[PDB]
Design an enzyme around this catalytic site. Structure first.
Site, mmCIF file in Angstrom:
data_model
loop_
_atom_site.group_PDB
_atom_site.id
_atom_site.type_symbol
_atom_site.label_atom_id
_atom_site.label_comp_id
_atom_site.label_asym_id
_atom_site.label_seq_id
_atom_site.Cartn_x
_atom_site.Cartn_y
_atom_site.Cartn_z
ATOM 1 N N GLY A 46 0.831 -1.187 0.000
ATOM 2 C CA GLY A 46 0.000 0.000 0.000
ATOM 3 C C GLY A 46 0.871 1.244 0.000
ATOM 4 O O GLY A 46 2.103 1.163 0.022
ATOM 5 N N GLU A 47 0.201 2.399 -0.038
ATOM 6 C CA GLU A 47 0.918 3.669 -0.022
ATOM 7 C C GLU A 47 1.404 4.063 1.366
ATOM 8 O O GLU A 47 2.105 5.074 1.495
ATOM 9 C CB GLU A 47 0.073 4.790 -0.638
ATOM 10 C CG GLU A 47 -1.229 5.089 0.086
ATOM 11 C CD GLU A 47 -1.959 6.274 -0.518
ATOM 12 O OE1 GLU A 47 -3.203 6.225 -0.616
ATOM 13 O OE2 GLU A 47 -1.285 7.254 -0.901
ATOM 14 N N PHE A 48 0.993 3.328 2.386
ATOM 15 C CA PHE A 48 1.274 3.447 3.799
ATOM 16 C C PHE A 48 2.115 2.329 4.470
ATOM 17 O O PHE A 48 2.543 2.460 5.589
ATOM 18 C CB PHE A 48 -0.061 3.472 4.480
ATOM 19 C CG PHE A 48 -1.066 4.398 3.835
ATOM 20 C CD1 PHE A 48 -0.768 5.723 3.637
ATOM 21 C CD2 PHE A 48 -2.327 3.948 3.473
ATOM 22 C CE1 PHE A 48 -1.694 6.598 3.074
ATOM 23 C CE2 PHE A 48 -3.261 4.817 2.913
ATOM 24 C CZ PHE A 48 -2.940 6.146 2.713
ATOM 25 N N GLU A 67 3.487 -2.187 3.841
ATOM 26 C CA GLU A 67 3.337 -3.429 3.094
ATOM 27 C C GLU A 67 2.988 -4.517 4.085
ATOM 28 O O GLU A 67 3.154 -4.350 5.298
ATOM 29 C CB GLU A 67 4.649 -3.839 2.407
ATOM 30 C CG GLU A 67 5.278 -2.745 1.512
ATOM 31 C CD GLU A 67 6.084 -1.736 2.298
ATOM 32 O OE1 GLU A 67 6.938 -2.170 3.115
ATOM 33 O OE2 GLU A 67 5.852 -0.513 2.109
ATOM 34 N N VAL A 68 2.545 -5.648 3.539
ATOM 35 C CA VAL A 68 2.347 -6.870 4.301
ATOM 36 C C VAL A 68 3.290 -7.908 3.737
ATOM 37 O O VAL A 68 3.362 -8.106 2.510
ATOM 38 C CB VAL A 68 0.886 -7.361 4.251
ATOM 39 C CG1 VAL A 68 0.693 -8.573 5.207
ATOM 40 C CG2 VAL A 68 -0.067 -6.230 4.611
ATOM 41 N N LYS A 112 2.834 -6.618 9.005
ATOM 42 C CA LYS A 112 2.385 -5.395 8.362
ATOM 43 C C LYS A 112 3.211 -4.232 8.885
ATOM 44 O O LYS A 112 3.405 -4.109 10.103
ATOM 45 C CB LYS A 112 0.912 -5.148 8.687
ATOM 46 C CG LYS A 112 0.289 -3.915 7.975
ATOM 47 C CD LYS A 112 -1.174 -3.744 8.468
ATOM 48 C CE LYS A 112 -1.810 -2.466 7.949
ATOM 49 N NZ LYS A 112 -3.147 -2.211 8.575
ATOM 50 N N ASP A 161 -17.412 -3.791 9.745
ATOM 51 C CA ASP A 161 -16.927 -4.027 8.372
ATOM 52 C C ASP A 161 -16.871 -5.512 8.100
ATOM 53 O O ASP A 161 -15.987 -6.007 7.397
ATOM 54 C CB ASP A 161 -15.563 -3.343 8.181
ATOM 55 C CG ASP A 161 -15.121 -3.234 6.735
ATOM 56 O OD1 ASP A 161 -15.991 -3.167 5.849
ATOM 57 O OD2 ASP A 161 -13.873 -3.220 6.534
ATOM 58 N N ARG A 196 -14.210 -10.439 2.470
ATOM 59 C CA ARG A 196 -12.871 -9.923 2.255
ATOM 60 C C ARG A 196 -12.116 -9.708 3.553
ATOM 61 O O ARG A 196 -10.886 -9.576 3.495
ATOM 62 C CB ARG A 196 -12.946 -8.593 1.492
ATOM 63 C CG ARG A 196 -13.603 -7.509 2.249
ATOM 64 C CD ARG A 196 -13.634 -6.110 1.459
ATOM 65 N NE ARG A 196 -14.548 -5.228 2.181
ATOM 66 C CZ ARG A 196 -15.863 -5.227 2.002
ATOM 67 N NH1 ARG A 196 -16.431 -6.040 1.091
ATOM 68 N NH2 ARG A 196 -16.610 -4.456 2.767
ATOM 69 N N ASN A 197 -12.796 -9.676 4.716
ATOM 70 C CA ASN A 197 -12.098 -9.442 5.965
ATOM 71 C C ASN A 197 -11.975 -10.714 6.770
ATOM 72 O O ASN A 197 -11.604 -10.654 7.966
ATOM 73 C CB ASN A 197 -12.845 -8.356 6.745
ATOM 74 C CG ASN A 197 -12.563 -6.968 6.174
ATOM 75 O OD1 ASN A 197 -11.483 -6.743 5.634
ATOM 76 N ND2 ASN A 197 -13.530 -6.063 6.228
ATOM 77 N N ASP A 217 -9.288 -7.889 10.205
ATOM 78 C CA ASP A 217 -9.301 -6.595 9.780
ATOM 79 C C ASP A 217 -10.112 -5.747 10.663
ATOM 80 O O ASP A 217 -11.167 -5.370 10.392
ATOM 81 C CB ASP A 217 -9.623 -6.539 8.294
ATOM 82 C CG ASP A 217 -8.833 -5.493 7.644
ATOM 83 O OD1 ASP A 217 -8.155 -5.739 6.651
ATOM 84 O OD2 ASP A 217 -8.867 -4.433 8.246
HETATM 85 C C1 LIG Z 1 -5.147 -9.180 9.405
HETATM 86 C C2 LIG Z 1 -3.996 -8.451 9.797
HETATM 87 C C3 LIG Z 1 -4.173 -7.216 10.401
HETATM 88 C C4 LIG Z 1 -3.073 -6.459 10.815
HETATM 89 C C5 LIG Z 1 -1.788 -6.955 10.623
HETATM 90 C C6 LIG Z 1 -1.595 -8.184 9.970
HETATM 91 CL CL1 LIG Z 1 0.025 -8.742 9.730
HETATM 92 C C7 LIG Z 1 -2.697 -8.933 9.554
HETATM 93 N N1 LIG Z 1 -2.501 -10.167 8.992
HETATM 94 C C8 LIG Z 1 -2.579 -10.367 7.644
HETATM 95 O O1 LIG Z 1 -2.800 -9.432 6.873
HETATM 96 C C9 LIG Z 1 -2.454 -11.619 7.098
HETATM 97 C C10 LIG Z 1 -2.403 -12.867 7.676
HETATM 98 N N2 LIG Z 1 -2.304 -13.915 6.796
HETATM 99 C C11 LIG Z 1 -2.350 -13.544 5.509
HETATM 100 N N3 LIG Z 1 -2.276 -14.404 4.489
HETATM 101 C C12 LIG Z 1 -2.408 -14.011 3.175
HETATM 102 C C13 LIG Z 1 -3.243 -12.998 2.690
HETATM 103 C C14 LIG Z 1 -3.319 -12.733 1.320
HETATM 104 C C15 LIG Z 1 -2.573 -13.496 0.438
HETATM 105 C C16 LIG Z 1 -1.785 -14.521 0.921
HETATM 106 C C17 LIG Z 1 -1.011 -15.320 0.096
HETATM 107 O O2 LIG Z 1 -1.478 -16.299 -0.492
HETATM 108 N N4 LIG Z 1 0.278 -14.969 0.106
HETATM 109 C C18 LIG Z 1 1.322 -15.684 -0.633
HETATM 110 C C19 LIG Z 1 1.498 -15.132 -2.029
HETATM 111 C C20 LIG Z 1 2.412 -16.086 -2.817
HETATM 112 C C21 LIG Z 1 3.606 -16.600 -1.970
HETATM 113 C C22 LIG Z 1 3.463 -18.087 -1.570
HETATM 114 O O3 LIG Z 1 3.388 -18.363 -0.350
HETATM 115 O O4 LIG Z 1 3.490 -18.921 -2.503
HETATM 116 C C23 LIG Z 1 3.850 -15.689 -0.751
HETATM 117 C C24 LIG Z 1 2.621 -15.522 0.151
HETATM 118 C C25 LIG Z 1 -1.715 -14.773 2.285
HETATM 119 S S1 LIG Z 1 -2.424 -11.816 5.366
#
Ligand SMILES: Cc1cccc(Cl)c1NC(=O)c1cnc(Nc2cccc(C(=O)N[C@H]3CC[C@H](C(=O)O)CC3)c2)s1
Length: 271
Positions: free
Chosen positions: A18-20, A22-23, A42, A135, A139-140, A153
């Protein structure tokens, strides 16, 4: 909220940007160095405002109040070093809406109902912990490798998931989250169809206020459609509570022949 030392975290791959911030997908060394676990990380990029910091750290503060199988687990935060990080468990299958769209038609009814039971159990826990999500949408929800769905989320609001009293009066409560859960039920049973298709926001509001509701998904158990319809009662006090939703879903799963009675779905003339 556990402060994590940066020497315990490694980043391996960018998940999204994102513009703020990355994850990332990375690893976390825990338990005095004896344990290593995959995590999502994140970041908040330099130059963030006070509001951004309050929101970013506030999301982790909220997440850290919860301990439930169906709520994403917080490992901790890096706030004393920059860039700041929130570190959660890693959910291998990502967001539920996108996951179902990539798996269209591949799960059983019982699997889909079990995903909704997990989401309902996480929402029941949030509601009883006095948290209103505001929300709730597929998607969340995140999905792990074992198909467990977890509410995430905890950080504008998409009209088409929102109950009418929250749209108009900004009256957000656990009962408006029940309306949203009804839309998530419809998302799950349709494998991620977009609620209300091409209608605009004002057309969705027009339809809902006239009493229109989303039609049955294909091959949907009558009991499941009846339940989502009850989630969409206009009068919020008539909606089920999340405790009722979990109880009903459990009873259906335990007597699965109850799921074989399908709601009617509705031109190709041939024979
Ligand atoms: C929900 C949340 C709120 C605040 C902070 C954080 Cl760190 C979070 N946690 C998260 O956003 C996440 C927890 N688990 C997540 N898994 C996720 C989400 C979207 C896509 C993918 C996904 O398939 N990622 C792959 C993409 C392809 C690669 C692979 O492994 O082959 C590398 C990772 C995984 S995102």
């Amino acid at each position: 909220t556990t402060e994590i030392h940066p020497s315990c975290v490694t980043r391996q791959k960018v998940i999204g940007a994102g513009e703020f911030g990355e994850v990332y997908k990375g690893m976390l060394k825990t338990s005095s160095g004896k344990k290593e676990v995959p995590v999502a990380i994140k970041t908040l990029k330099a130059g963030y405002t006070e509001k951004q910091r309050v929101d970013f750290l506030g999301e982790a503060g909220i997440m850290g109040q919860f301990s439930h199988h169906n709520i994403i687990r917080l490992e901790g935060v890096i706030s004393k070093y920059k860039p700041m990080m929130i570190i959660t468990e890693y959910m291998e299958n990502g967001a539920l809406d996108k996951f179902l769209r990539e798996k269209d038609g591949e799960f059983s009814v019982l699997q889909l109902v079990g995903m909704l039971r997990g989401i309902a159990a996480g929402m029941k826990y949030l509601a009883n912990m006095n948290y209103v999500h505001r929300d709730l949408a597929a998607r969340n929800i995140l999905v792990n490798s074992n198909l467990v769905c977890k509410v995430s989320d905890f950080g504008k609001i998409p009209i088409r998931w929102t109950a009418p009293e929250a749209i108009s009066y900004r009256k957000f409560t656990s009962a408006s989250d029940v309306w949203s859960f009804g839309i998530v039920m419809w998302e799950v049973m349709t494998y991620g169809e977009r609620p209300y298709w091409e209608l605009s926001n004002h057309e969705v509001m027009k339809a809902i206020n006239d009493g229109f509701r989303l039609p049955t998904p294909m091959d949907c158990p009558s009991a499941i459609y009846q339940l989502m319809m009850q989630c969409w009662q206009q009068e919020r006090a008539r909606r089920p509570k999340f405790a009722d939703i979990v109880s009903i879903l459990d009873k259906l799963i335990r007597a699965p022949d109850s799921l074989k009675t399908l709601a009617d779905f509705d031109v190709s003339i041939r024979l």
